[PDB]
Design a protein around this ligand. Sequence first.
Ligand SMILES: *[C@@H]1O[C@H](CO[C@@H]2O[C@@H](C)[C@@H](O)[C@@H](O)[C@@H]2O)[C@@H](O[C@@H]2O[C@H](CO)[C@@H](O)[C@H](O)[C@H]2NC(C)=O)[C@H](O)[C@H]1NC(C)=O
Ligand SMILES: *[C@@H]1O[C@H](CO)[C@@H](O[C@@H]2O[C@H](CO)[C@@H](O)[C@H](O)[C@H]2NC(C)=O)[C@H](O)[C@H]1NC(C)=O
Ligand SMILES: *[C@@H]1O[C@H](CO)[C@@H](O[C@@H]2O[C@H](CO)[C@@H](O)[C@H](O)[C@H]2NC(C)=O)[C@H](O)[C@H]1NC(C)=O
Ligand SMILES: *[C@@H]1O[C@H](CO)[C@@H](O)[C@H](O)[C@H]1NC(C)=O
Ligand SMILES: *[C@@H]1O[C@H](CO)[C@@H](O)[C@H](O)[C@H]1NC(C)=O
Ligand SMILES: [Zn+2]
Ligand SMILES: [Zn+2]
Length: 423
Amino acid sequence: HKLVPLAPAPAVGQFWHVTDLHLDPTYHITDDRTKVCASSKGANASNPGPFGDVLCDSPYQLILSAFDFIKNSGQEASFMIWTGDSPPHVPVPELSTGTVIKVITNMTMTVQNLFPNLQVFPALGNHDYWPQDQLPIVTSKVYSAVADLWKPWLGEEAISTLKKGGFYSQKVASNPGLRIISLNTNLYYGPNIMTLNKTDPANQFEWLENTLNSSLWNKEKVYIIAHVPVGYLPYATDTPAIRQYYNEKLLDIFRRYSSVIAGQFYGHTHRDSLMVLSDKNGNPLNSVFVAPAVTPVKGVLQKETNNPGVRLFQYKPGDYTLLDMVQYYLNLTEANLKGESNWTLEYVLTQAYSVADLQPKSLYALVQQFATKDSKQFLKYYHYYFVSYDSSATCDQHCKTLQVCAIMNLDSMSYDDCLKQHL
Ligand SMILES: *[C@@H]1O[C@H](CO[C@@H]2O[C@@H](C)[C@@H](O)[C@@H](O)[C@@H]2O)[C@@H](O[C@@H]2O[C@H](CO)[C@@H](O)[C@H](O)[C@H]2NC(C)=O)[C@H](O)[C@H]1NC(C)=O
Ligand SMILES: *[C@@H]1O[C@H](CO)[C@@H](O[C@@H]2O[C@H](CO)[C@@H](O)[C@H](O)[C@H]2NC(C)=O)[C@H](O)[C@H]1NC(C)=O
Ligand SMILES: *[C@@H]1O[C@H](CO)[C@@H](O[C@@H]2O[C@H](CO)[C@@H](O)[C@H](O)[C@H]2NC(C)=O)[C@H](O)[C@H]1NC(C)=O
Ligand SMILES: *[C@@H]1O[C@H](CO)[C@@H](O)[C@H](O)[C@H]1NC(C)=O
Ligand SMILES: *[C@@H]1O[C@H](CO)[C@@H](O)[C@H](O)[C@H]1NC(C)=O
Ligand SMILES: [Zn+2]
Ligand SMILES: [Zn+2]
């Protein structure tokens, strides 16, 4: 037979996920530690170095080290997802629309300059707007500016919806049959006073339903990406990450389409968390991966924070089932002491937890293990939750119940049931 595609001589696809870069262009080592970074809001940086400080957002040197690590890692990857939050945590009057656009431009061009051939799928974060959190339900300067910045990666239809509402879907050029849906979940975030009481802000739910329907009929698989996740904040009691009304509506769509959705990937929490979306009777439907931040920032009172992280997913080519996740990190104290970075493997999920893959069943069974008393699996998970920032951090019985309940129960009814039974 002539002119047949050439067969291979077990291939695995891979993609990167980076999030919550939070560049602080003010960062510099100075004798007066209240002047190291505007993101410390006048507190003395604790022990600052070239790669940052726990009381500061990311120096450019830290962000560049993360992307240089990716570039030089020897990992092949066919795309990258980037789930938002580029400007630093400074007060509203210290920023502006133009300043926000300048920072997002810097990060976008850093990526485009270092990875000219790599398609990247961004999502907007709640800090990717001026004033922060107030992302609107109609077009805006920011939405237009990111549409221009991200045009190398996005087709006409995606640019159109991004300009209008901050969301889009896009085919993955290197992966026929895979579509990325990039939601603007900041429309559902509590502090957003521009969307209070709207049943379908920016018509994103209607759009999402229609997009998933078309993916079904076009035999596509979907990865969902967004900044703010669904479900419950695992360190708090009964505090959904987005407003309850919206969390419930979004989860209803995700459950119904859970056979088309092969992955969900979020940021915002600056922590390494898992969730398993199940139906009301506890049949696992969809795996959810919240990635930790590059920035190590924390407030003055907060007891723990994260080390900087970036992560890589492995998936089945042409099928898009998730096979593994490799979490990398920077030991910030180690890097700052010597002045050179050593981005390094934190863990491989299948090896760390002795699971076969990232399918909902495999993670659902793992979390049953977490729940057993003195589970070594949960102890490891809690260490990884802060990206190995503090091995002596402990999670008492109340803390663990809040964590496990949030991992397994993404809707209000299931979550409440879990707390009533175990708290
Ligand atoms: C769900 O999608 C089907 C399929 O529609 C087509 O296939 C998609 C992959 C995409 O290419 C769409 O643009 C296509 O229209 C919808 O069924 C079609 O609906 C149109 C009217 O809008 C009708 O003229 C066609 O005959 C329908 N085709 C079939 C096979 O039924 C369907 O309406 C969508 N459902 C919902 C609830 O949105
Ligand atoms: C993004 O911003 C950084 C600095 O905020 C720019 O970097 C300057 O030059 C080198 C590398 O180009 C940095 O290490 C320095 O920190 C920066 N200079 C000064 C005086 O601080 C970088 O060029 C910007 N990138 C883009 C694409 O705009
Ligand atoms: C990151 O690097 C720091 C500094 O090297 C490590 O700090 C060690 O912390 C343990 C307690 O957790 C101490 O007993 C050691 O003496 C410290 N080592 C040094 C050389 O100071 C820290 O453990 C590292 N983080 C990880 C996850 O390995
Ligand atoms: C910062 O640290 C120095 C100690 O070297 C101290 O004199 C100064 O008052 C501190 N400022 C604040 C706000 O903690
Ligand atoms: C809007 O407010 C009313 C009453 O305050 C409430 O019944 C309704 O569910 C709210 N809608 C949304 C989308 O929050
Ligand atoms: Zn953030
Ligand atoms: Zn955020």
